């Protein structure tokens, strides 16, 4: 959605971190809970 | 017979039928026979 | 500069002072434990 | 502003067009194509005076055209463009007019852009149907067109003392002959042809054909040269196409190639019509003959200036093509009809054309006997007319034509997105 | 699934092709080309399974063709695509098939894709030879085609009350005439032909011509109009191309332009045959005359619908082209023969084209007199046949031709990388 | 060095051109168009305020190389063409510019994947031809070609364009089957001063045309050939006439003539069975459509294995169309003469290494310059005392060298 | 040695000591080119120029004058200039 209203992939223009921060804020409102996109995509189970 | 080429496993070793046949019903690791007994019920509830 | 050992040394000595690298790395222990298993699970005899 | 500034912007609009075409049906979600980024970047640069990023082009593109139409419609505004100076110099004028300030401004990178242009004339396979830019530069700054760029010889045709027309000659070439008439040098789309027609056989010997000024800049590659009786699918009388496996070979020679060039052979030839005259040695007598050169034609290096500057034109009246503008107008015209402005627009161009012509002759007054037979977009015919005024010295007539052309071209480029409603 | 879902994917495969063409011989060692970048990413979008860099793009492209042939053959599977509604509504069908799941889904970015598309019709130089995707859209959804895309008149042709065909009308144009016959209107690849044949001279004066339904869509630019006596290279008898410098001017006018258009002149013209008729004025009587319009042919704005919808068809039987599908099949065919399936395919196709027609006529049964004179890939002919069934009324016939076409094309695109082994 | 190496670089140079064409007038100030970024990177991949410079230097260093037997000799040897074997030569032009450029195996798996693409280039790069003529590689299945190029000499017919003067001469009696070709159409028929009965006639497809394939074709009757009247034949009909059709081994169905139908059929059958439905005082059938070269059979054309007679008629694989520029530059700096004399030795010396013992064969005199290849190709294919096969290679080989020049010399400017 | 710029593997006191690259590239060349185009070139040029001509086949200045009799070579009709 964010990328649709924007016209391109947010990452093409901004730092991924800055984008995630927006997604977080949003998603979290949809499920009532501080969510952290980051943690879902780690290198392994041992490395964060 | 090679069921899975080593280059396609995180553990770099071919998956032969001989490496599956002695275990359980003796079916190949990739095509293990499923216990679909409660299948229809899951599908309705919308479980995986 | 290259006519005098002193001169050259002074210039080199200076040129290098400015390099300032800052890298980002995973937790060592994590990687060495992950790769660790990969080895153990697949090696047939203490792999050097 | 600068004649350059307009060209630059035009070039950009044309680039935008090009990339819109490149992107058509290649816009898949989840994938940002390098092409789409370039298309996007260009949009940005278009509305550079009001934005630093663009979402959807549908609007700014429209706006630009609408404003442009509203511009070349009012003499009061676009007047500065109809003066003799605007076509001659690169002096940055000062015009207080929203359209000019907002859209017309430097676009091309100098000097790197020029360097590439040159490196191009040398390229192996240039565009077969080039952009308007190229033409605009040729006709205005008289720059070179690519060496390997193909062209249809018939366009290149101009009037010369001998034969007044090219297509008109079709009628005479079809009428059986009385005597052994003067030699004819005429041209088609994909082949040029010459010969001599008579009712009585021609003594198998040596004949000299003078190559007409207009064609003395042509060059062919991959050409077959045969004997024929048609011209645009029209039969020519007073010409034999008959020949026997026993006949003595017929060959021609050119002042460039020291070697003889065979005729009625399956060999693909390469030669140049520049340099002077074609020496044809007819091996067997024939009752009227027509040699045909069919292949790929290109204008010789550094000679395009003749075509595009109207130096091919020796006498008046003369028949001339339109450099293909008509093939570009199509869109803008179709858009004018779509909103019934096709009427008013014409009356405006007429005013423009006139106002332009005026500024060229001193004292400032429409010449006597200036009667247009065709509408602003049938250029070919209108240029003929400008070029036929006996009371205005040639050089000026040419300029009128060259200048009017650029403006027409510009219109064909900038108006395309017109939709007032 | 959705008809739209199929088109979208076709466009993708059709795009993958485009870029494969672009990358050929441009794949160097240390370079990163926007083209190869696009390509390699598109290679990814095919398979729902995996997204890793494709080391060998042949593999998945093959698996896809194979899966497709295996789908398109079994009527139990691809049946849903042969329903009346599939070619009509965008209602996602409740069908579960391995192919459809793995390869078909929406892929074009919305709304951007459409925006670009329309912006394109206005582009200056559209593709001279369009992807199938464009036709798919015109034939199925009735979308507009680029305002300045060229087209060869003769394809556009259809049968009219007056004359039955175009190509066949040739032989008659050859035979000298009994007496002053009725006007003819034929079309070649690069030119339109009209005139009146007679053995006796016909007076100098005004003559009205009714432009046909199929040709009232045409429009030309950069055109030379003259008197000729050839049709597709064949000689037309009962017409003269004679003339002299004294002859009075021979002008013709069209409703769209309030100015006289000259004939047998070196000027390049542009006019619209959408006016409904041509008004010719012979300046000097001729023993049978034939006018030719040779230039760049384009389909007027918002009129391509007549051609692609089969609405230009009024008679029965009728002459109908194939929208060029034949030209795209080439590859697939040569690939079929390669593995010996050219045979087995033709049989699955006949079952397809049959089973298709079936669903089109209520009540549900094959028509009487369905005599297929040609194989599935000679579409042009099979269309004539479908359109010749007196049983079913015109509309349902047309609909079947269109629906058939879309399927045909869909194959021409997906099959190509087919290799069973 | 390696023939491969020369090809790769040729390709790169051809690519540099492609992109220079792509960047003309698309070089704006606020952007860096994906194309230009690539062009920039290719320029760099050769050895940059002025791209003209390095490009020039490259061409210059080339002319002086290809112009000296002592240097480029190794390329004229028999082996260079035959194998991908390492050259022993150590000359700096080679070291500087000639070396592998194409990614692998990817570069290949693409050109393969190509052949099957829907819309291949209308006007192919020399690279593609080079590959066919040298390694005998497949051309894109859907690539169009003008058939008259494909023409070679055969049993009955000496040539193609020459038959024109004959087809224009009224006949004496019913003659033999003719099979000519134009740029956009195939012509076949039987002329006669006396009507030919209605029935079945068998035509044989010449060895050269037996590769063609047509799509979107209008097959009808005509009396024209290259815009020249075909006498002794009359295409005339009546809405009454019985249907005239034809058939080919390929397709099991009858294909109509004089119909407004788009036909698809291949001449790969070797014969065309015509059924004349009405007697005609001379008839000529025309096949006008899109001609492609049948899959897997382009070889014949490019290997020159399409030839059986001696002498023969032959085209230049379009090479003459690429020389245009290089020539223009030669004329600009008076080298035109000099280069030609040098090329004559290049050619002379090249032929030499092909025949044992190493001596210019007797009776060898060129009637045309180095760049009228179509002719020189003939002259070479006309030597009677020389074996035939080695004769074909000499042309194939001489072609590549020529193509190479057409590509590398373009930026030549010494002064 | 006359046909190419190949660095020779030869060790000789002379060559080592005196024969070495001495011209500023690419500047030297550009100045040379820029020259052929200049107004009054040297009327009695250095051997250098001639060397580059005879060896590399480079251009000479457009305005440099010469005595045509040197330019003379023999042709079909006359086998000589002075002899005539």
Curated annotation (Swiss-Prot), chain B:
Signal peptide: none
Region of the whole protein represented: 487 to 534 of 1019
Organism: Rice dwarf virus (isolate Akita)
Subcellular location: Virion; Host cytoplasm
Name of the protein in its database record: Outer capsid protein P3
Family: Belongs to the phytoreovirus inner capsid protein P3 family.
Subunit structure: Homodimer. Homomultimer.
Function: Capsid protein which self-assembles to form the inner icosahedral capsid with a T=2 symmetry, and consisting of 60 P3 dimers.
UniProtKB/Swiss-Prot annotation, chains D, E:
GO molecular function, one term: host cell surface receptor binding
GO biological process: one example: symbiont entry into host cell
Pfam family, one: Phytoreo_P8
Record-annotated disulphide pairs: none
Stored SUPFAM superfamilies: A virus capsid protein alpha-helical domain (SSF48345), Viral protein domain (SSF49818)
One cellular component (GO) term of this entry: viral outer capsid
InterPro entries, per database record: Capsid_hemagglutn (IPR008980), Phytoreo_P8 (IPR009807), Virus_capsid_a-hlx_vir (IPR008935)
Function: Capsid protein which self-assembles to form the outer icosahedral capsid with a T=13 symmetry, about 70 nm in diameter and consisting of 780 molecules capsid proteins.
Protein's name according to its UniProt entry: Outer capsid protein P8
Originating organism: Rice dwarf virus (isolate O)
From Swiss-Prot, chain G:
Taxonomy, superkingdom: Viruses
Family of the protein in this entry: Belongs to the phytoreovirus outer capsid protein P8 family.
Subunit structure, interactors included: Homotrimer. Homomultimer. Interacts with host peroxisomal glycolate oxidase (GOX). This interaction mediates its relocation to virus factories peripheral to host peroxisomes.
Job of this protein: Capsid protein which self-assembles to form the outer icosahedral capsid with a T=13 symmetry, about 70 nm in diameter and consisting of 780 molecules capsid proteins.
Name assigned to this protein: Outer capsid protein P8
Organism: Rice dwarf virus (isolate O)
Parent-record interval covered: 86 to 169 of 420
């Amino acid at each position: 959605t964010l990328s649709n209203k924007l016209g391109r992939n947010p990452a093409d223009i901004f730092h991924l971190e800055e984008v995630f921060k927006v997604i977080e804020e949003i998603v979290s409102v949809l499920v009532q809970q501080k969510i952290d996109v980051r943690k879902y995509f780690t290198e392994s189970m041992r490395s964060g | 017979e090679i069921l899975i080429p080593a280059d396609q496993t995180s553990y770099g070793a071919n998956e032969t039928r001989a490496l599956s046949a002695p275990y359980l019903f003796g079916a190949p690791i990739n095509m293990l026979a499923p216990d679909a007994r409660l299948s229809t019920y899951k599908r309705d509830l919308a479980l995986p | 500069v290259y006519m005098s050992p002193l001169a050259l040394n002074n210039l080199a000595s200076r040129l290098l002072r400015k390099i300032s690298l800052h890298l980002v790395m995973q937790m060592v222990t994590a990687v060495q434990q992950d790769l660790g298993e990969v080895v153990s699970v697949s090696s047939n005899v203490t792999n050097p | 502003m600068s004649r350059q500034m307009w060209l630059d912007t035009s070039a950009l609009l044309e680039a935008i067009s090009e990339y819109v075409v490149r992107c058509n049906g290649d816009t898949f979600s989840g994938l940002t194509t390098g092409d789409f980024n370039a298309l996007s970047n260009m949009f940005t640069q278009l509305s550079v005076s009001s934005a630093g990023y663009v979402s959807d082009p549908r609007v700014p593109l429209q706006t630009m055209s609408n404003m442009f139409v509203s511009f070349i419609t009012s003499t009061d505004r676009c007047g500065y463009m109809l003066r003799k100076t605007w076509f001659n110099s690169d002096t940055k004028p000062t015009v207080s007019d929203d359209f000019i300030t907002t859209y017309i401004r430097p676009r091309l990178q100098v000097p790197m852009s020029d360097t590439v242009r040159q490196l191009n004339n040398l390229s192996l396979q240039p565009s077969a149907k080039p952009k308007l830019y190229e033409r605009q530069n040729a006709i205005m700054k008289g720059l070179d067109i690519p060496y390997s760029e193909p062209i249809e010889p018939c366009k290149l045709f101009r009037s010369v003392a001998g034969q007044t027309g090219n297509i008109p000659m079709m009628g005479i070439l079809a009428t059986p002959p009385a005597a052994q008439q003067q030699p004819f040098f005429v041209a088609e789309r994909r082949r040029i042809l010459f010969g001599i027609r008579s009712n009585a056989a021609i003594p198998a010997g040596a004949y000299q054909f003078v190559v007409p000024a207009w064609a003395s800049v042509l060059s062919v590659t991959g050409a077959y040269v045969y004997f024929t009786n048609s011209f645009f699918g029209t039969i020519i009388a007073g010409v034999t196409a008959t020949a026997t496996a026993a006949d003595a070979a017929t060959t021609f020679t050119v002042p460039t190639d020291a070697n003889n060039l065979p005729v009625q052979t399956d060999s693909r030839l390469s030669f140049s019509l520049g340099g002077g005259n074609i020496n044809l040695e007819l091996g067997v007598a024939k009752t009227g003959f027509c040699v045909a050169i069919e292949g790929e034609f290109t204008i010789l290096a550094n000679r395009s200036q003749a075509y595009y500057t109207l130096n091919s034109i020796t006498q008046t009246p003369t028949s001339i093509d339109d450099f293909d503008v008509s093939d570009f107008l199509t869109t803008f015209l179709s858009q004018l009809r779509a909103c019934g402005q096709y009427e008013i627009f014409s009356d405006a161009m007429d005013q423009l054309t006139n106002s332009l012509i005026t500024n060229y002759m001193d004292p400032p007054a429409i010449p006597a006997g200036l009667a247009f037979t065709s509408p602003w977009f049938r250029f070919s015919e209108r240029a003929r007319t400008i070029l036929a005024l006996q009371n205005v010295d040639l050089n000026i007539r040419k300029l009128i034509v060259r200048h009017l052309w650029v403006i027409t071209s510009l219109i064909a480029v900038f108006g395309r997105y017109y939709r007032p409603n």
